[PDB]
Amino acid sequence: ICYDAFVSYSERDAYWVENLMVQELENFNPPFKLCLHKRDFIPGKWIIDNIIDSIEKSHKTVFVLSENFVKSEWSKYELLFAAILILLEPIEKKAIPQRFCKLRKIMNTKTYLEWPMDEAQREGFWVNLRAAIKS
Amino acid sequence: ICYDAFVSYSERDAYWVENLMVQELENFNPPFKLCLHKRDFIPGKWIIDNIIDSIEKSHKTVFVLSENFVKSEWSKYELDFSHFRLFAAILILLEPIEKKAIPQRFCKLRKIMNTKTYLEWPMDEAQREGFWVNLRAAIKS
Amino acid sequence: ICYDAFVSYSERDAYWVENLMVQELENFNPPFKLCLHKRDFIPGKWIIDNIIDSIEKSHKTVFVLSENFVKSEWSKYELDFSHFRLFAAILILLEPIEKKAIPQRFCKLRKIMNTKTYLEWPMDEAQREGFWVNLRAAIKS
Amino acid sequence: ICYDAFVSYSERDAYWVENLMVQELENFNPPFKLCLHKRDFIPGKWIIDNIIDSIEKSHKTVFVLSENFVKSEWSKYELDFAAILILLEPIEKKAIPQRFCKLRKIMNTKTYLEWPMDEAQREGFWVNLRAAIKS
């Protein structure tokens, strides 16, 4: 085991993950060891490779859910269920196709963390996230 | 499986790989069949593919370490290609690399640089005769 | 698995599949989960895969056989998807076909028209009420 | 088993395969059951699928060798591991890159059949072939 978490996010949500989340975690004290998929990996796309082995070499895996993540990043996983979900923006459970089940399942169960649209509550969001990670 | 070794290096440490090691390994008798990174990858296909097909079509992969390579090439072999479990891979430490200067995300390489299991290019021309003796020794293992 | 069954059919045989089979299966109670070939296959993906992403994403595969079908869409499963050895796959037979008009390259489909293992869709405006019951039971099987 | 033989060839040698070869066999009597790869399968490219399986469904496997066969068809074999070879055009064992070795093997095994450069021997070319095919 090498990192405390594998963060699977989408190139669009990149800003949030590589900037803000990285700030509230990799710059914590003591710091968290993060393996950001989109930042650390060759921007080419894959599966067997790393992902699993990279995941299995990190204490936890974070899926930064959002509509962007559905379009382009989920598609693979459907085709770890330990796993920490993060709902960055509200996704319409319905608006989610019926061919993307495992998501729905893992979704509805509610083993997820919801990022707040209210600046004030962010301070707490992390607190729960770090806790979840360090769980 | 057509090569003896797939040498992966940085353009920075070019001269050495191309003008010293190659001579040393290719001319040696008998000679070695080498696949060469920044000097001989096939068109069309994208690099990473070439890199793979190479890593795949050759007995061993010889990595030429150097702060500049750790900064621009090593990420690949420890992540995107983790599934290749390359860590039999031979490592050459061309120059010195302080451990603490190694990105924290690179645990395989850190374990490498701690286990001191790499061929270290000597600065005393005298000792190279031996360097070369283990490099082949290694490749041909 | 994310779908109860994946219906593979021609475009000439739609009304049947898309209006009846749907009504009878996607409106039962409790309703079924169906993946209709010429209806829910995504764009950004190439058909073949689009298929493999359904075959595997469903408990069973329903092959609405017809004359047209064999002509315009059977090949795919005779060799392309011949590694999946689909022959648990349900085989419907919506209309008659002369076993002599079936291409000789379609070995497997031959065996299909011999062991006559499939649900033939009846002309009997009465014996049909039982086709769909044999259908569901094949799916839910 | 179901096919008399399998034909692996480069899209660029089709006119010879999908034409001369066929009108010489699939149109013989009794006709041969041939499954030409570039002709019958979907133009998508793969490996596990078909090929080995479709191969395990023919009494033989015929490779139509030629510079074009290497540029687009052999690369696939060299990486993965009865066989009738049909050298269409003379291919110098030199031009064969050091990365096409399982090839220089089969090649330097001279277990092939050459396409004659003289109209005369043509009619004969087809004989030896049909032989090896049915044999």
SS3 C36: strand
Write out the DSSP string of A54-90: HHTTBS-EEEEESHHHIIIIIHHHH----EEEEESS-
Residue closest to C38 by CA, chosen among C62, C65, C8, C59: C8
Between CA A81 and CA A76 the distance in angstroms is: 15
Residue A17: Cβ within 10 Å count: 23
> Do the two chains B and D touch, given a threshold of 8 Å on CB pairs and at least 3 pairs?
yes
Q: Do C53 and A98 touch (CB under 8 A)?
A: no
Determine which of B49, B75, B79 to mutate to test the interface with A (most A C-beta atoms within 10 Å).
B79
> How many alpha carbons fall within 13 Å on the CB side of residue A68?
16
Q: By CA distance, what is D79's nearest residue in B?
A: B57
Residue closest to D74 by CA, chosen among D95, D54, D49: D95
Residues of B with Cβ-Cβ distance to A50 under 8 angstroms: 79-83
Write out the DSSP string of chain D: --BSEEEE--GGGHIIIIIIIHHHHTTSSSPP-EEEHHHHS-TT--SIIIIIHHHTTBS-EEE--SHHHIIIIIHHHHT---EEEEE-S---TTTS-TT-HHHHHHHTTT-EEE--SSHHHHHHHHHHHHHHHH-
Cis peptide before D30 (omega within 30 of 0): yes
**Sequence letter at residue A48:** I
- Structure tokens that stand for D68 in this block: 């074009």
B57, D78 contact by CB (below 8 A):
yes
Cα B134–chain centre separation = 14
Cis peptide before D31 (omega within 30 of 0): no
B44, A11 contact by CB (below 8 A):
no
CATH number, domain of C140, equals: 3.40.50.10140
Q: Do C40 and A102 touch (CB under 8 A)?
A: no
| Shortest alpha-carbon distance between residue A51 and chain B (Å) | 8
Q: Which of D44, D48, D54 sits opposite C79 (nearest CB)?
A: D54
Q: Which residues pair with D50 in a beta bridge?
A: none
Q: By CA distance, what is D48's nearest residue in C?
A: C83
Burial class of residue D43 (count of CB atoms within 10 Å of its CB; 0-12, 13-18, 19+): exposed
Q: Do D99 and B1 touch (CB under 8 A)?
A: no
Cα D83–chain centre separation = 9
Q: Which residues pair with C8 in a beta bridge?
A: C63
| Shortest alpha-carbon distance between residue D101 and chain B (Å) | 6
Q: Do B3 and D98 touch (CB under 8 A)?
A: yes
Between CA B20 and CA B15 the distance in angstroms is: 7
State the residue for tokens 């891979």. B89
Between CA D57 and CA D35 the distance in angstroms is: 10
Q: What's the resolution in A?
A: 3.2
- Helical H runs in chain C? 22-26, 37-40, 47-55, 67-73, 75, 107-114, 131-139
Write out the DSSP string of B46-101: -HHHHHHHHHHTEEEEEEEE-HHHHHHTHHHHHTTTGGGT---EEEEE-S---GGG
Q: Do A99 and C2 touch (CB under 8 A)?
A: yes
Q: By CA distance, what is B110's nearest residue in A?
A: A2
Q: Which of D35, D42, D48 sits opposite C83 (nearest CB)?
A: D48
**What is the count of residue pairs from C and D with beta carbons less than 8 Å apart?**
33
Residue B52, CA distances (Å) to B47, C52, D83, D118, D119 in order:
8, 26, 28, 43, 45
Q: Do D50 and C80 touch (CB under 8 A)?
A: yes
| Shortest alpha-carbon distance between residue D14 and chain C (Å) | 19
Provide the Cα torsion C114, C120, C124, C130; round to 10°: 130
Burial class of residue D93 (count of CB atoms within 10 Å of its CB; 0-12, 13-18, 19+): exposed
Q: Do C53 and A102 touch (CB under 8 A)?
A: no
Residue A7, CA distances (Å) to A34, A73, D92, D94 in order:
7, 12, 52, 49
State the residue for tokens 């992902």. A51
> Do the two chains C and D touch, given a threshold of 8 Å on CB pairs and at least 3 pairs?
yes
Between CA C54 and CA C36 the distance in angstroms is: 9
The domain tally of chain C equals 1
C78, C102 contact by CB (below 8 A):
no
- Structure tokens that stand for B9 in this block: 């290096």
Query: What are phi and psi for residue A22, nearest 5 degrees?
Result: -65, -35
Q: Do A100 and C2 touch (CB under 8 A)?
A: yes
| Shortest alpha-carbon distance between residue A13 and chain C (Å) | 21
Q: State the residue range of the domain holding D124.
A: 1-135
**Chain B residues touching chain A at CB-CB below 8 Å:** 46, 48, 75-76, 79-83, 104-105, 107
D86, D112 contact by CB (below 8 A):
yes
Residue closest to D74 by CA, chosen among D48, D110, D50, D104: D104
